[PDB]
Amino acid sequence: MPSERTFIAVKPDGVQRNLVGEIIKRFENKGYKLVGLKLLQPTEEQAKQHYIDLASKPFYSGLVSYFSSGPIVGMVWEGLGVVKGGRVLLGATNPADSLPGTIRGDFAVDVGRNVCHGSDSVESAKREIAFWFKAEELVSWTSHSVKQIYERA
Amino acid sequence: MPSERTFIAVKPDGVQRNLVGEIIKRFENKGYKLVGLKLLQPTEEQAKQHYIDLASKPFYSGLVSYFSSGPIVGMVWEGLGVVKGGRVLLGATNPADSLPGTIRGDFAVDVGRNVCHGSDSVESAKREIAFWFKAEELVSWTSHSVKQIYERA
Amino acid sequence: MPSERTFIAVKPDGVQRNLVGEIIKRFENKGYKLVGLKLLQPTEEQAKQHYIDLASKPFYSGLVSYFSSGPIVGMVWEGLGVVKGGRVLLGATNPADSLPGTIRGDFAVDVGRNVCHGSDSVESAKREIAFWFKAEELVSWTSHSVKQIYERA
Amino acid sequence: PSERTFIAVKPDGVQRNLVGEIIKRFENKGYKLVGLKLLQPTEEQAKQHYIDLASKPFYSGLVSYFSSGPIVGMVWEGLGVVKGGRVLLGATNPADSLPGTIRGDFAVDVGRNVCHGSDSVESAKREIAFWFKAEELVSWTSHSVKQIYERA
Amino acid sequence: MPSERTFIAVKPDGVQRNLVGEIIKRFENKGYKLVGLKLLQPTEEQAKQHYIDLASKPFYSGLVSYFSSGPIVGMVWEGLGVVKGGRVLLGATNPADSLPGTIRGDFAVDVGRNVCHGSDSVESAKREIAFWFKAEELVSWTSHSVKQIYERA
Amino acid sequence: PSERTFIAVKPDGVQRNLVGEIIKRFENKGYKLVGLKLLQPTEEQAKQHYIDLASKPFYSGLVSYFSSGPIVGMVWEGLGVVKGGRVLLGATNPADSLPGTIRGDFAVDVGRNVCHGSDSVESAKREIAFWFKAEELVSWTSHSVKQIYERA
Numbered sequence: 032m033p034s035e036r037t038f039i040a041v042k043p044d045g046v047q048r049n050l051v052g053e054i055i056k057r058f059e060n061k062g063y064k065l066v067g068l069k070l071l072q073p074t075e076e077q078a079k080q081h082y083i084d085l086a087s088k089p090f091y092s093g094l095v096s097y098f099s100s101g102p103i104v105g106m107v108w109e110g111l112g113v114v115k116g117g118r119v120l121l122g123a124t125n126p127a128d129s130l131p132g133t134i135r136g137d138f139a140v141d142v143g144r145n146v147c148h149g150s151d152s153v154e155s156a157k158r159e160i161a162f163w164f165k166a167e168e169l170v171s172w173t174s175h176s177v178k179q180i181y182e183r184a
Numbered sequence: 185m186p187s188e189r190t191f192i193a194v195k196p197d198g199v200q201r202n203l204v205g206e207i208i209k210r211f212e213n214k215g216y217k218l219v220g221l222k223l224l225q226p227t228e229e230q231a232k233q234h235y236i237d238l239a240s241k242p243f244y245s246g247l248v249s250y251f252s253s254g255p256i257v258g259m260v261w262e263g264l265g266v267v268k269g270g271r272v273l274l275g276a277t278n279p280a281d282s283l284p285g286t287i288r289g290d291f292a293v294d295v296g297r298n299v300c301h302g303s304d305s306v307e308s309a310k311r312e313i314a315f316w317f318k319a320e321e322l323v324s325w326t327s328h329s330v331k332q333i334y335e336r337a
Numbered sequence: 338m339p340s341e342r343t344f345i346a347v348k349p350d351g352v353q354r355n356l357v358g359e360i361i362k363r364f365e366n367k368g369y370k371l372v373g374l375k376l377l378q379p380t381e382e383q384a385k386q387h388y389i390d391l392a393s394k395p396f397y398s399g400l401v402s403y404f405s406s407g408p409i410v411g412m413v414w415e416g417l418g419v420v421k422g423g424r425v426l427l428g429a430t431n432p433a434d435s436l437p438g439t440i441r442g443d444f445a446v447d448v449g450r451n452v453c454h455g456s457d458s459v460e461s462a463k464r465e466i467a468f469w470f471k472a473e474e475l476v477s478w479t480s481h482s483v484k485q486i487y488e489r490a
Numbered sequence: 491p492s493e494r495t496f497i498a499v500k501p502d503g504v505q506r507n508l509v510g511e512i513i514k515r516f517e518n519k520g521y522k523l524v525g526l527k528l529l530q531p532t533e534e535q536a537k538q539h540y541i542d543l544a545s546k547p548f549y550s551g552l553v554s555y556f557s558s559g560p561i562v563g564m565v566w567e568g569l570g571v572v573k574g575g576r577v578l579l580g581a582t583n584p585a586d587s588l589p590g591t592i593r594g595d596f597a598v599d600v601g602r603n604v605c606h607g608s609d610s611v612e613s614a615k616r617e618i619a620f621w622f623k624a625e626e627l628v629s630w631t632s633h634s635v636k637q638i639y640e641r642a
Numbered sequence: 643m644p645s646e647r648t649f650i651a652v653k654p655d656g657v658q659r660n661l662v663g664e665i666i667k668r669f670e671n672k673g674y675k676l677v678g679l680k681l682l683q684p685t686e687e688q689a690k691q692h693y694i695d696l697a698s699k700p701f702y703s704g705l706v707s708y709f710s711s712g713p714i715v716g717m718v719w720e721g722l723g724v725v726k727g728g729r730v731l732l733g734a735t736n737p738a739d740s741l742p743g744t745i746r747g748d749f750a751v752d753v754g755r756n757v758c759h760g761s762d763s764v765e766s767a768k769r770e771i772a773f774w775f776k777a778e779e780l781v782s783w784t785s786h787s788v789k790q791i792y793e794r795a
Numbered sequence: 796p797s798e799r800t801f802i803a804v805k806p807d808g809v810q811r812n813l814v815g816e817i818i819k820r821f822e823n824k825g826y827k828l829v830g831l832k833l834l835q836p837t838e839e840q841a842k843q844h845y846i847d848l849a850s851k852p853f854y855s856g857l858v859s860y861f862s863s864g865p866i867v868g869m870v871w872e873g874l875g876v877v878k879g880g881r882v883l884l885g886a887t888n889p890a891d892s893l894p895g896t897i898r899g900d901f902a903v904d905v906g907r908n909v910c911h912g913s914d915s916v917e918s919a920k921r922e923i924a925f926w927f928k929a930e931e932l933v934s935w936t937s938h939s940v941k942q943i944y945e946r947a
């Protein structure tokens with residue numbers, strides 16, 4: 032259904048390198064609907080929990096330190112297939128494997144400085160959204176372009 | 185041969201969502217030559233004929249209604265391999281399958297709101313060009329850049 | 338009134354230099370509505386008439402020859418203040434006087450190769466639209482975005 | 491360089507997919523984002539934000555529209571950012587705004603003019619205080635600060 | 643005459659902030675012709691001589707130190723009125739006074755970090771070009787678009 | 796991260812006003828420009844640069860065209876930049892290149908394919924040595940190096 036949601040974050044390198052607007056533009060251009068947006072400074076414990084599935088991996092310590100080293104921009108986007116589609120926009124995890132046209136393909140080199148995050152499944156997206164956003168920070172609204180973007184609307 | 189031609193249309197969602205300029209720019213940037221251009225309101229019967237091969241498909245009635253719901257921009261582009269190359273610029277029919285960099289990859293979500301059309305073969309292109317354009321509507325001209333774009337020119 | 342209309346043309350240098358998409362994009366981005374569009378080859382006599390007020394000027398013969406030397410893209414745009422606003426988007430007649438941000442400011446050098454034309458008043462626009470377009474060539478439609486662009490809509 | 495301003499993408503700007511474009515322009519200029527939120531103003535927030543226009547005949551419509559859907563509120567930091575932000579936005583009436591500015595490139599009607607920016611250092615301080623809690627601002631150092639400023 | 647030339651430099655901040663391509667694009671888009679291009683590290687003495695007219699000004703010391711602190715990209719552009727036109731593209735000296743659409747209007751804040759330089763007169767342009775470029779580094783060529791950009795060509 | 800590659804805008808790319816666009820793509824990616832020059836290759840330079848194609852039937856035409864007008868030669872530095880540069884360029888035949896790449900967005904014909912990039916670390920070292928004198932390369936530290944690389 033077009034009401035699917037995903038969590039996207041500009042990581043601290045993406046904020047530092049002035050990629051916030053560019054990343055948001057790509058999601059707006061695609062037809063996805065912005066329903067949550069904030070600038071925040073993750074704590075180490077927040078980073079640990081966000082990446083909890085990766086706790087045994089050797090990059091985890093550095094990942095958690097880096098993710099909490101400076102501000103991120105957290106977002107919630109709504110749209111048909113937006114979890115998968117958000118990942119398509121981001122490009123492959125390792126920028127070396129990402130193609131031009133994607134965020135990581137255009138703007139990143141190193142897997143540890145890969146500028147952005149996106150939820151990897153509908154289930155993890157729900158968890159991430161719930162973790163980073165309060166219900167008061169999510170806005171219910173209708174895009175005036177909804178019938179131009181979706182057939183069934 | 186560099187004189188190959190194809191029919192590209194901005195569908196009514198593409199016009200509504202202000203993608204006419206962006207789509208033309210992509211074709212110009214590639215090196216293709218614009219030889220026909222018009223804004224028109226297809227009739228339902230024109231839409232039925234344009235998509236006649238698809239008459240048995242479950243989506244046909246909706247396709248034909250939508251395509252005739254408002255203005256399209258019809259184009260004829262000329263260049264080496266332009267039929268296939270135009271379709272590559274458009275991206276996969278279903279935008280969920282389209283890659284970033286392409287028109288559908290960058291701007292569309294839903295297969296029924298996929299912003300554009302391109303002819304699928306040399307012979308269908310000839311048919312579509314003849315259906316939408318009278319002989320006197322095409323403009324033959326030489327790009328000042330033809331020898332920078334083509335080795336053989 | 339938001340139903341005001343103007344005639345804009347991409348002149349033959351603008352077509353040759355692949356500025357058609359870029360010019361249309363600027364008008365779409367502004368909120369103006371495309372209601373007429375075609376590619377055509379003006380005749381010398383059409384060019385003489387289009388610029389008839391300038392018949393005594395030293396540049397007229399060159400202007401009329403050039404304007405009829407290859408294809409133009411003719412457009413009719415609709416929107417509040419579109420005659421004046423279209424000219425603002427174009428920039429100063431002589432590109433040496435045009436500011437960055439405008440079409441001439443960004444893309445042109447020479448007053449005789451200034452890439453585009455726009456009607457200079459409401460009444461000249463009506464004349465130019467009638468000269469270049471038959472009634473049946475215009476397309477009336479409602480932008481899905483009209484109430485986001487205009488308070489009164 | 492620690493001057494701050496409040497910039498909002500108005501509901502028309504959100505609806506018309508200009509959030510990223512607007513943020514990009516401010517990032518490109520060298521300004522630093524220190525606050526960002528998406529919210530739908532209440533009627534009362536809309537009345538207060540525009541409190542100096544309460545006696546104008548366009549007020550109730552401005553209030554209703556500003557509270558009709560989400561805005562994006564921003565706090566930007568930088569040398570001369572109050573004046574600079576308004577230069578990026580362009581003239582209040584898009585008819586008067588020049589290409590290159592946000593209103594010049596994207597808006598037609600004064601009542602649907604896409605964005606807001608504080609008009610002075612003091613009004614910025616008041617708008618920031620109105621729209622953001624203390625804990626919602628983020629203090630950080632751009633790694634590019636010495637490239638943007640001589641005195642850093 | 644269209645053979646006028648000017649010296650443009652991306653200053654060390656402009657190089658550091660990844661504005662080389664953007665600056666070159668703006669000059670290419672305008673119709674100006676690139677006839678010299680190099681990356682170099684100015685010496686302090688080179689910076690002193692380049693800015694010799696400003697030797698008594700209180701910012702001079704800091705200007706010369708900064709200009710020689712890292713690489714610049716030096717360019718020579720050719721075109722009708724290119725000295726004045728290059729300055730128009732750059733925008734006002736102090737970015738606070740520069741308008742959006744210009745290089746300094748779009749990308750700079752501080753007069754001491756104003757990302758680029760352009761010659762201020764035909765005479766100073768000749769001096770600057772001669773100072774920064776050897777004759778072997780200037781390329782004589784003809785743009786295939788010269789007749790599309792200039793009437794008299 | 797100290798890997799280097801040679802990228803050239805070919806004479807068609809210069810003529811078609813793609814120099815800035817190409818440089819922008821490499822800067823945006825995070826790669827560092829350490830050499831840059833505009834020059835018109837001699838016939839002999841064109842023959843040598845393409846020496847591994849000397850037995851091909853398209854050679855003399857490639858040589859004549861490559862020496863017909865100015866190119867822009869570049870040296871870029873960064874992790875995996877040889878492979879990365881070629882990914883940015885796209886497939887050799889623009890018919891096979893995808894949108895988003897330089898050839899995918901801007902070229903049609905294999906003989907007018909806008910740009911060149913070294914095919915390997917060793918060929919890059921040889922191309923760099925051929926096109927640039929030692930004194931023409933500039934060593935410098937991007938202020939953004941720690942934002943682009945974890946190990947910096």
Ligand SMILES: Nc1ccn([C@@H]2O[C@H](COP(=O)(O)OP(=O)(O)O)[C@@H](O)[C@H]2O)c(=O)n1
Nearest residue numbers: 085090094123124142143144145148149151
């Ligand atoms: N070998 C690796 C793998 C991942 N990572 C980082 O760990 C993050 C999370 O890994 P992940 O497997 O969930 O990948 P994504 O979901 O981000 O694509 C990545 O986005 C990288 O920034 C790393 O630094 N080195």
Ligand SMILES: Nc1ccn([C@@H]2O[C@H](COP(=O)(O)OP(=O)(O)O)[C@@H](O)[C@H]2O)c(=O)n1
Nearest residue numbers: 243247276277295296297298300301302304
């Ligand atoms: N399952 C489908 C397939 C196609 N369509 C629409 O029907 C149009 C014509 O289908 P097609 O098979 O000719 O595909 P293209 O030639 O447009 O790639 C597509 O462009 C879609 O807009 C659809 O709505 N649902």
Ligand SMILES: Nc1ccn([C@@H]2O[C@H](COP(=O)(O)OP(=O)(O)O)[C@@H](O)[C@H]2O)c(=O)n1
Nearest residue numbers: 396400429430448449450451453454455457
């Ligand atoms: N001194 C001049 C004035 C105008 N012209 C050309 O003549 C066209 C018509 O002139 P105009 O006075 O109607 O100006 P616009 O309405 O195009 O601003 C201009 O757009 C120029 O292309 C010229 O070549 N030399």
Ligand SMILES: Nc1ccn([C@@H]2O[C@H](COP(=O)(O)OP(=O)(O)O)[C@@H](O)[C@H]2O)c(=O)n1
Nearest residue numbers: 543548552581582600601602603606607609
């Ligand atoms: N005559 C007017 C004046 C202002 N307005 C709106 O009211 C807003 C606030 O007015 P203002 O005087 O504070 O102008 P700015 O601070 O936005 O430049 C404007 O941005 C317009 O959207 C209007 O609709 N009609």
Ligand SMILES: Nc1ccn([C@@H]2O[C@H](COP(=O)(O)OP(=O)(O)O)[C@@H](O)[C@H]2O)c(=O)n1
Nearest residue numbers: 696701705734735753754755756759760762
């Ligand atoms: N008050 C000033 C004036 C100039 N400058 C710097 O000195 C440079 C040369 O000054 P200039 O008067 O030749 O200005 P332009 O020709 O660069 O516009 C400027 O581009 C500034 O970078 C400064 O740092 N502070």
Ligand SMILES: Nc1ccn([C@@H]2O[C@H](COP(=O)(O)OP(=O)(O)O)[C@@H](O)[C@H]2O)c(=O)n1
Nearest residue numbers: 848853857886887905906907908911912914
């Ligand atoms: N069949 C071919 C193959 C290559 N070429 C040209 O020769 C150049 C060098 O060939 P190459 O095999 O080194 O390919 P790349 O390294 O450029 O990918 C290509 O970039 C083409 O411009 C051609 O014109 N026809």
Ligand SMILES: [Mg+2]
Nearest residue numbers: 148149150151
């Ligand atoms: Mg993950």
Ligand SMILES: [Mg+2]
Nearest residue numbers: 301302303304
């Ligand atoms: Mg089909």
Ligand SMILES: [Mg+2]
Nearest residue numbers: 454455456457
């Ligand atoms: Mg006129």
Ligand SMILES: [Mg+2]
Nearest residue numbers: 606607608609
């Ligand atoms: Mg105000």
Ligand SMILES: [Mg+2]
Nearest residue numbers: 759760761762
């Ligand atoms: Mg000066």
Ligand SMILES: [Mg+2]
Nearest residue numbers: 911912913914
């Ligand atoms: Mg090769």
